[PDB]
Design a protein around this ligand. Structure first.
Ligand SMILES: NNC(=O)c1ccc(O)cc1
Ligand SMILES: NNC(=O)c1ccc(O)cc1
Lengths: 457, 456
């Protein structure tokens, strides 16, 4: 039953002598053993190794808690190095990549006492809203096994939603935290520029700054307290990441005004999503926020410019290098969807798109001085069937992109955003993470508490 | 007399009752009237309006000093909006672009009491190490009128070196502060990421983030105190610039080690420049710095990657749009020089260059954890003749680029750097501006005082 509990509640049990760390870990591992065959969400376990950590801490500390994550089991996305685990990007060709060292973000979670159970499932290359890999197969939604878990952090979202771990760690370049979190009915927090360093001491490939500006690390959890705890532990400068900053956290702003994004990026929304947006508007208003509809300009270009920039790179640089190493469904997702938006081979087109990005960014930054939070859908539909994006072709891929238009503008503009379990998100300005989490509590105080799913056919 | 003085000294004259603000402004405007025909460095004045400002302050305040730049005459590069002045980018087609509002950096200088005398000369598009425009012609070096003032902030540097203003405001994407400051024998401080916001409320042309990451605003002046004063006044978040940060200034590092960059970026250096580098090494050693030579790796790709990234954009995006609007020497500088490095039309090559930028940045960031300051030449030669880059062709442009190889790597990697009046610079890590300025002061304690030139 610690599988149903938040970090604070688990630590309370440990503090009172009601459970040992070893017992907490055993409960999660037993649950994983019972149901992970169905979800396929923990793809590489370190069961023996984490049990050793738990027992060691029990022997040394007993019911005294050490660091602020002592006793809390974690899921980590395959992409983030954990010393002694493999980092594969889903690809069989990388099955031999075994890391000697943690990434900085993972190191901080572990140094604080976090008990990493294993690596979580992902799509090949981490470029998909569906966590299907050549090495591990498909992650299924624990809330309904016929449905996608989302992606690219689908494994972590699924592990948290199923009670396999208390907190997960993902990344978000095009919705990789927010999409699976919302589709699995949990919280997912995409942090903002400067806070959490992305440092891999094992040696990563080197990236285009344009892509790095759109990507951030963040936690997935079943409560905002757990989101905040993981966020605070991971935040801090490391000068090995050029985009990391020594800037401290900024206290939540008094009385931010909230703008509603509904159709202003051209998204095609299900009635159920429109109804969740309406409900979330009213939760914020009841909390005392001023929330305004129909105040944003026409921003249909924002997700399109994201797809142009990302798609051009995927089609003209990435795919030529990795085409034969990825599963057919990954290749064809990139061709079918990003092929609709990629700008061709002329550098002049790519440069023009980069200028448009800056123009949109300027417009939105100016308006967010007035509307410091934007409330928006995440996906335009609830979790779709598992094969929703598998060899669906150009026309259907454009229709999918249209359903997801409230997602990737956030990445384009480099903004933090909290995805709520009901598929709505709170987007804030750069550096205003704590304002976002405060607003999130307006939802948390009113919506039913997140409960773990028991996967069943 | 106030034309020779630093900001602190001018303000002391006002405090003493020895000069009014109006008299300070008159002395500078009179000097401009006498010599600006030779330098062509102040290209548009607001003489009546700035005298009005000085008189209003004199009436209300008398010898009481107001804000921290009260009484201090300023030069502002054409590129940075000043309310009531035109912003032309040197192009006759833009001679009617009149701004209603200050840029944020300009507004902060003015709000602090600074007295903007006018706009300073520039090259067409601000893409050149020589401040030659279609609208205003050539800025000439006040220290030697046969020589370039540098660019693209050549007007501001010349104005400060000639005593037409106390402090100037420029920008630096490929040396635009450091090159003209050094060639005019004054200080020029390229600030680092996050510090000074670049916000034009009148509507600036939108720019590629890649270029924006390499560009920073900063002051030109005749002392470190004046550099620091202007720097601190302009620093502060403005969220309209998404690159600006609320991060404060960081106190100078205790005992930073200094790495010497001489030939490691492939630069071809004059003997006089090598000797200025040696002299500065000894000045810093005498002030207690540990300075080490031959500690840097082979960084010859750093300036090349800058030229590839910049050049590809200039050739494939900028020139197609403005080719008929710029003087032929500006067009041909781009073709002759950047044409040697541009990557061609394939987006794949540009993406590859972007990846290499990140790799170099990470390598240099790691080594600057040990060597927190890099000491380097700016240009490989003292200020060249005014025609040095005028329709020179491909081979000559490669030779010129090789002479300038210690300059643009700083931009590529997003680093702050102070150019000293002798053509040497002090480069620091991101956010470490005050450590740089401390080392600048060490130079200033050992070197001759900067004096203004009288153009003749
Ligand atoms: N990590 N990856 C992402 O956030 C992401 C997810 C889906 C994409 O089409 C592109 C990027
Ligand atoms: N602002 N402009 C610069 O710093 C700059 C200077 C010289 C160039 O070839 C390109 C840019």
């Amino acid at each position: 039953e610690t599988t149903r509990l938040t970090a604070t509640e688990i630590r309370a049990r440990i503090s009172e002598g009601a459970a040992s760390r070893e017992e907490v870990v055993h409960e999660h591992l037993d649950r994983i053993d019972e149901f992970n065959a169905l979800t396929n969400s923990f793809v590489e376990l370190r069961a023996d190794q984490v049990l050793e950590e738990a027992r060691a801490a029990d022997r040394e500390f007993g019911s005294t808690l050490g660091g602020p994550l002592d006793g809390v089991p974690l899921s980590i996305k395959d992409s983030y190095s954990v010393a002694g685990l493999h980092r594969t990007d889903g690809l069989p060709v990388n099955a031999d990549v075994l890391d000697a060292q943690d990434d900085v973000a993972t190191a901080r979670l572990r140094a604080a006492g976090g008990l990493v159970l294993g690596h979580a499932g992902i799509p090949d290359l981490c470029i998909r809203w569906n966590s299907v890999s050549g090495l591990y197969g498909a992650v299924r939604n624990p809330r309904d096994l016929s449905r996608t878990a989302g992606g690219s952090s689908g494994g972590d979202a699924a592990n948290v939603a199923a009670g396999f771990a208390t907190i997960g760690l993902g990344g978000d370049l095009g919705g990789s935290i927010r999409v699976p979190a919302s589709w699995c009915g949990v919280y997912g927090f995409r942090t903002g520029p400067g806070r959490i360093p992305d440092v891999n001491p094992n040696g990563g490939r080197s990236r285009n700054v344009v892509m790095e500006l759109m990507a951030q690390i963040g936690p997935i959890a079943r409560s905002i307290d757990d989101i905040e705890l993981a966020f605070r532990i991971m935040t801090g400068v490391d000068r090995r990441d050029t985009m990391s900053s020594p800037l401290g956290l900024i206290e939540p702003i008094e009385a931010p005004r909230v703008a509603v994004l509904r159709h202003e990026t051209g998204a095609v929304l299900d009635s159920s999503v429109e109804e969740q947006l309406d409900a979330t508007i009213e939760m914020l208003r009841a909390e005392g926020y001023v929330v305004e509809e129909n105040v944003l300009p026409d921003l249909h270009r924002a997700p399109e410019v994201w797809a142009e920039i990302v798609g051009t790179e995927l089609i003209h640089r990435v795919l030529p290098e990795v085409a034969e190493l990825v599963i057919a469904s990954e290749r064809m997702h990139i061709v079918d969807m990003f092929g609709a938006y990629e700008l061709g081979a002329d550098v002049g087109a790519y440069l023009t798109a980069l200028e448009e990005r800056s123009s949109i960014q300027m417009t939105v930054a100016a308006l967010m001085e007035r509307y410091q939070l934007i409330l928006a859908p995440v996906a335009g539909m609830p979790a779709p069937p598992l094969d929703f994006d598998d060899h669906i072709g150009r026309e259907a891929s454009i229709a999918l992109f249209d359903q997801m238009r409230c997602v990737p503008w956030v990445n384009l503009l480099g903004l933090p955003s909290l995805a709520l379990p009901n598929g709505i998100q709170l987007v804030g300005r750069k550096h205003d993470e704590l304002t976002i989490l405060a607003a999130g509590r307006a939802y948390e105080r009113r919506a039913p508490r997140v409960e773990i799913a028991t996967p069943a056919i």
